[PDB]
What we know:
The structure holds 3 protein chains of 3 kinds.
Chain A: H1 4-15, E1 22-24, H2 33-50, H3 55-71, E2 84-86, H4 88-103
Antiparallel strand pairs in A: 1-2
Helix pairs in contact in A: 1-3, 1-4, 2-3, 2-4
Chain B: E1 5-8, E2 14-19, E3 25-30, E4 37-40, E5 54-58, E6 62-67, E7 76-84, E8 89-92, E9 96-100, E10 108-112, H1 116-119, E11 124-133, E12 139-144, E13 147-149, E14 153-155, E15 165-173, H2 175-179, E16 184-190, E17 193-199
Parallel strand pairs in B: 1-9
Antiparallel strand pairs in B: 2-6, 3-4, 3-7, 5-6, 7-8, 7-9, 10-11, 11-15, 12-13, 12-16, 14-15, 16-17
Chain C: E1 3-6, E2 10-12, E3 18-25, E4 33-39, E5 45-52, E6 58-60, E7 68-73, E8 78-83, E9 92-99, E10 119-123, E11 132-136, E12 147-157, E13 163-166, E14 174-177, E15 181-182, E16 188-197, E17 207-212, E18 217-222
Parallel strand pairs in C: 2-10
Antiparallel strand pairs in C: 1-3, 3-8, 4-5, 4-9, 5-6, 7-8, 9-10, 11-12, 12-16, 13-17, 14-16, 15-16, 17-18
Amino acid sequence: NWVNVISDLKKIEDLIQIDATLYTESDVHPSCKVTAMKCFLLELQVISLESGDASIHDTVENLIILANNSLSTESGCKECEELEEKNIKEFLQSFVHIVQMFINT
Amino acid sequence: TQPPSASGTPGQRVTISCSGSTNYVYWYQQLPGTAPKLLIYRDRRRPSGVPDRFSGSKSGTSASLAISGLRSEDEADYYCAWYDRELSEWVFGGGTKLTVLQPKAAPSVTLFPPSSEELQANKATLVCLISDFYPGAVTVAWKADSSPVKAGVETTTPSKSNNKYAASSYLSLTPEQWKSHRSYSCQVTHEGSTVEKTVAPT
Amino acid sequence: QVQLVQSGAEVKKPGASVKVSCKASGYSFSSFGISWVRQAPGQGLEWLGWISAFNGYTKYAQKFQDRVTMTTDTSTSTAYMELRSLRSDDTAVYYCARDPAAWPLQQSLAWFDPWGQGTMVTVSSASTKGPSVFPLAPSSKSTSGGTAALGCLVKDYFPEPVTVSWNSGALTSGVHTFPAVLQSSGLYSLSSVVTVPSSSLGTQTYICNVNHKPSNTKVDKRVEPKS
Lengths: 105, 202, 227
């Protein structure tokens, strides 16, 4: 479920070959992590937005379906708005990581 | 906060201001008789399918919509939006009507007093018919005798078959209300120029 | 291809309710959200609130929180907007728009794309009512320039629409039928004008033909110079 999302991250981290900056987190406190995912999930769509691509929409969509349902809240967490702003590269990768944490849980 | 009105000539580079007091600002284009459409997001960004011509910027405590290469197709209402993090709500600019020019023209105003027949109805409608004007924006002020009136007034937003706009304004009074005054005046204002018509219960 | 397709124009009385629908096509309706915005005639946009098509969580705007109810149906890929205890000033085109937020926290970073065609909603304490046609006779006070102006004033009908031709579609010249005005009374009234030759008056015969199908009324009125 969480493992499916990794594979999808690659397709895109590809299909992309630019863009701008997304809100990313790696200071990922286990205890603040479902919030981190939500932020990631939103941001993710910023790619569909910029990309006219059909295939990547279908991909982020597949990913959201997985993620959304997996999740289905916490305290003291950082808002999305107050996250680091990284590249389409670091975001993706930083996504990959936060999925892993979910995995080991 | 944005200006309600913006003008531009084809090929012109125009600007729409969305100001206030500071985060992210978005832009939406509402073509005439359609639903709004996303133009700009997160200040600067353009979703796919949104022309170069279209660009946004944020500076000081106010963002704006830079629209270049102007076309007629671009004739619409532009609304900026933002998220009031304090109210935890989405809020919209008041909008900015944007007119893409293609000639110009004054307004032909005609004031009709209540037909004899309507008085029989125990009513009285004053009708101010405004026509053949470009651009389509008028101000209509009503007068009882000398003293300006606001009550009973209903004015339509200009529509279009000359390409020239036309609007209408009705004053509602009682037959006594009508006869209880010497005169009545309709006065329309177009591009700082004002033309006034009159009538008398005689 | 992505679409939102909403329901049809509605007419309602004060204190009544409307339920506007918004059918989603071309995507995973359920992975995302819906935002509702409205637009009073000739006025601005105001966001009503939001809903996750995923969890059904909602967020109402203070101005509406007391009377709205947003929901969704994963099965019909339809979001609903319900506004109750309708008041006059609720008269407005209501839109829906896809919204990337399935979760409330995300909703702050939202954009609306795309939008439904919208759904006109008219709150009028009235029912079907035929027009009352009064003449707007020409005069030496409505003429001229070799050209005079005359027409018909169509009052207190309901609902829309009325249709005005002149001399049975014949005369189409400087004819202009204005759009109606929704009066405080919850009744419509409009006007049709037509610029003629100042000289054809008192000779040529001009009849405006008012047509109100909703009320089964068709009225023909001869407009002539007052005496």
